Amino acid sequence: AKCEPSQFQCTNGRCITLLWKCDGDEDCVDGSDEKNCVKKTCAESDFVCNNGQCVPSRWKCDGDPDCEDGSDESPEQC
Amino acid sequence: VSITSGASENSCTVEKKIRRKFVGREEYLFPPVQGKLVKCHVYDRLKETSA
Amino acid sequence: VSITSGASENSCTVEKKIRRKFVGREEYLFPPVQGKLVKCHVYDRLKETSA
Ligand SMILES: [Ca+2]
Ligand SMILES: [Ca+2]
């Protein structure tokens, strides 16, 4: 049957869409928004990392390597 | 459509009855946050789509 | 009518029913590219003319 996004139902039994998969805001527990779709990965609030990761810019120089390349903790700015 | 450049300020107009329209069965000025997700059509904002 | 001055800005308005009119027997928003030429009256753009 149809449901609020007019599309597929995730395994939890909740309804989801490929467009919302890349809205930047998690829709369901299993699959959806972590799996690949075309995305504005960094918002204006976010800082890019050289390995291609994107992280909330406020995390930069906070003390933890929050992007997997550690670019957010380089003494180049911190 | 108008070019507000000043240094080349100009405009163009054509008669066209672009009146308010609304998908569904009820008149509204703005889509209400909550409602039925009925099928509708909108011009895709992505400039790469081909009409 | 208004004087765009910001600090010295002022304006005055009068209840005039200046409704869009048309010459001939067809309404139009704009005189089209062409059609029948008909006698009409226009307020001339030249200040030397007198009413
Ligand atoms: Ca989402
Ligand atoms: Ca950090």
From Swiss-Prot, chain A:
Domain LDL-receptor class A residue range list: 1-39, 40-78
Effect on the protein of changing residue 64 to I: Complete loss of entry of Semliki virus into the cell
Entry superkingdom: Eukaryota
Tissue spec. comment: Abundant in heart and skeletal muscle; also ovary and kidney; not in liver.
Disulphide connectivity of cysteines: 3-15, 10-28, 22-37, 42-54, 49-67, 61-78
The record's account of how the chain is modified after translation: Glycosylated.
Subcellular location, record wording: Cell membrane; Membrane, Clathrin-coated pit
Functional summary from the UniProt entry: Multifunctional cell surface receptor that binds VLDL and transports it into cells by endocytosis and therefore plays an important role in energy metabolism. Also binds to a wide range of other molecules including Reelin/RELN or apolipoprotein E/APOE-containing ligands as well as clusterin/CLU. In the off-state of the pathway, forms homooligomers or heterooligomers with LRP8. Upon binding to ligands, homooligomers are rearranged to higher order receptor clusters that transmit the extracellular RELN signal to intracellular signaling processes by binding to DAB1. (Microbial infection) Acts as a receptor for Semliki Forest virus.
Disease implication from the record: Cerebellar ataxia, impaired intellectual development, and dysequilibrium syndrome 1: An autosomal recessive, congenital, non-progressive cerebellar ataxia associated with disturbed equilibrium, delayed ambulation, intellectual disability, cerebellar hypoplasia and mild cerebral gyral simplification. Additional features include short stature, strabismus, pes planus and, rarely, seizures.
Record's subunit section: Homooligomer. Binds to the extracellular matrix protein Reelin/RELN. Interacts with LRP8. Interacts with LDLRAP1. Interacts with SNX17. Interacts with DAB1. Interacts with PCSK9. Interacts with PAFAH1B3 and PAFAH1B2, the catalytic complex of (PAF-AH (I)) heterotetrameric enzyme; these interactions may modulate the Reelin pathway. Interacts with STX5; this interaction mediates VLDLR translocation from the endoplasmic reticulum to the plasma membrane. Interacts with CLU. (Microbial infection) Interacts with protein VP1 of the minor-group human rhinoviruses (HRVs) through the second and third LDL-receptor class A domains.
Protein name: Very low-density lipoprotein receptor
Organism field: Homo sapiens (Human)
Gene designation: VLDLR
